[PDB]
């Protein structure tokens, strides 16, 4: 694979690592999740362009739309949680255990 593909895949890995290793704000986790979507967009776009997969040039757009939908969902959940607790701290989500 070309070094650019390696860099994009590494970007996805880094964003995944940041998402899985929360710190305080749930907003930061959502940012990492959306970053991963961006990296996947770039990867798929490069692959489709290089392969000249003309009929599959619509795949990145569909990925982008669904990505932003699931984000709209995440944000809506974050504001519900913040309105209930006062902050978007991940530690606040502690009522449910095990």
């Amino acid at each position: 694979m070309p070094l650019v593909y390696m860099n994009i895949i590494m970007a996805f890995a880094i964003a995944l690592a940041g998402l899985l290793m929360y710190r305080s704000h749930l907003m930061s986790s959502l940012l990492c999740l959306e970053g991963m979507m961006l990296s996947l967009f770039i990867m798929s776009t490069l692959i489709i362009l290089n392969t000249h997969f003309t009929l599959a040039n619509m795949m990145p757009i569909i990925l982008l739309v669904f990505a932003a939908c699931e984000a709209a969902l995440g944000l809506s959940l974050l504001v519900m949680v913040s309105n209930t607790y006062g902050t978007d701290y991940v530690q606040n989500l502690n009522l449910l255990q095990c």
Binding site: N7, A11, A15, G18, R23, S28, L31, G35
Partner: peptide, 11 residues
């Protein structure tokens, strides 16, 4: 791109 990903992935 990787550098920026590290930047925002540092939370």
């Amino acid at each position: 791109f990787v550098i920026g990903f590290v930047g925002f992935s540092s939370k």
